[PDB]
Ligand binder design. Structure first.
Ligand SMILES: Cc1cc2nc[nH]c2cc1C
Ligand SMILES: O=C(O)CNC(=O)C(=O)O
Ligand code: NI
Ligand SMILES: [Zn+2]
Length: 327
């Protein structure tokens, strides 16, 4: 078996290898990349997402989210308080203000220490889940707005035709902005391109060990666990690497820099934080190997977790018992 220790692998495709997206994902998996739950892909040196990021300041963040923490430094939840709309230019200015800017630090490790020590005492503002794309329409390779759709994957594999669409989201971050422990909707893959700005640090649990994270989460957030059989779907729970280590949970970490892709694999729990002002674009996707994970995906039915229009069809076809129980 390839990659038995479930290490995060880093790939450097040539421009020739960067032409066929599906083929390269399959190649990464042939090398065991999926066992980690997360992989980094550094694009060919000749490749660009777009010519410049010069004129993005007029993008609107209709509903910026203030991420307010509760708990202790290594075990906390966050809720999102909606704020008034602001442009990306205004958001960038806010991110660089004295109140919100990245503190002095020695290196990524020092900054990581500061994040876990001090995160809960601040409430950074995140621009999340903004439908759109910053890929130039003429970018032919790894254009996250031009991927084959999950609906077409399901149709090719299973012969069922379903409603629904599949488009990218933009994420504008600042220092300490946080993404909670989660797998993707329907335990899909995701791909994430860091367009510009400061780095993003990721933590990930190997898919084969996901239940270990679930069990720890039930112990650490016992009320939440009683309220919902899949409360990590709510995307509000954080657990630090120190607490994971103390509880013997297998995980890895890596920092993504501007110009790099990350892929998360089916049922790879991940969490992380932004180092400073940045912009990422992400979208879910599927492969034939995903289908069995989609069938097994745990669902929130307490009502807290958002179920998109397109998710409906996934549940209806892959999980008809769970769907009927909904209805
Ligand atoms: C181990 C395991 C547990 C799961 N629970 C939901 N999907 C799953 C997929 C795997 C692989
Ligand atoms: O970047 C973020 O804020 C969170 N992104 C993801 O969880 C992802 O791409 O799968
Ligand atoms: Ni994700
Ligand atoms: Zn729930």
């Amino acid at each position: 078996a390839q990659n038995p220790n479930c290490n995060i692998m880093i790939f450097h495709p040539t421009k020739e290898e960067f032409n066929d997206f599906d083929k390269y994902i399959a190649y990464m998996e042939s090398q065991g990349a999926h066992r980690a739950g997360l992989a980094k892909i550094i694009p060919p040196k000749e490749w660009k997402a777009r010519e410049t990021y010069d004129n993005i300041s007029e993008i609107l963040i209709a509903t910026p989210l203030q991420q307010v923490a509760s708990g202790r430094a290594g075990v906390f939840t966050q809720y999102h308080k909606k704020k008034k709309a602001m442009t990306v230019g205004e958001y960038r200015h806010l991110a660089n203000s004295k109140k919100y800017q990245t503190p002095p630090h020695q290196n990524f490790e020092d900054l990581e220490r500061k994040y876990w020590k001090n995160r809960i005492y601040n409430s950074p503002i995140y621009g999340a889940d903004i439908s759109g794309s910053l890929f130039d329409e003429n970018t032919k390779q790894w254009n996250l707005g031009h991927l084959g759709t999950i609906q077409d994957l399901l149709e090719k594999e299973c012969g069922v035709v379903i409603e629904g669409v599949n488009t990218p989201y933009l994420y504008f971050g600042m220092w300490k902005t946080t993404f909670a422990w989660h797998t993707e909707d329907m335990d899909l893959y995701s791909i994430n391109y860091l367009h510009l700005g400061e780095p993003k640090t990721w933590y990930v649990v190997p898919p084969e060990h996901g239940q270990r994270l679930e069990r720890l989460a039930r112990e650490l957030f016992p009320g939440s666990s009683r309220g919902c059989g899949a409360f990590l779907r709510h995307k509000v729970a954080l657990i630090s690497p120190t607490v994971l280590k103390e509880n013997g949970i297998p995980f890895n970490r890596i920092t993504q820099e501007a110009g790099e892709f990350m892929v998360t694999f089916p049922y790879g729990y991940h969490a992380g934080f932004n180092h400073g002002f940045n912009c990422a674009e992400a979208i879910n996707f599927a492969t034939p190997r995903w289908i069995d994970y989609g069938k097994m995906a745990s669902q929130c039915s307490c009502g807290e977790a958002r179920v998109t229009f397109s998710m409906d069809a996934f549940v209806r076809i892959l999980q008809p018992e769970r769907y009927d129980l909904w209805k």
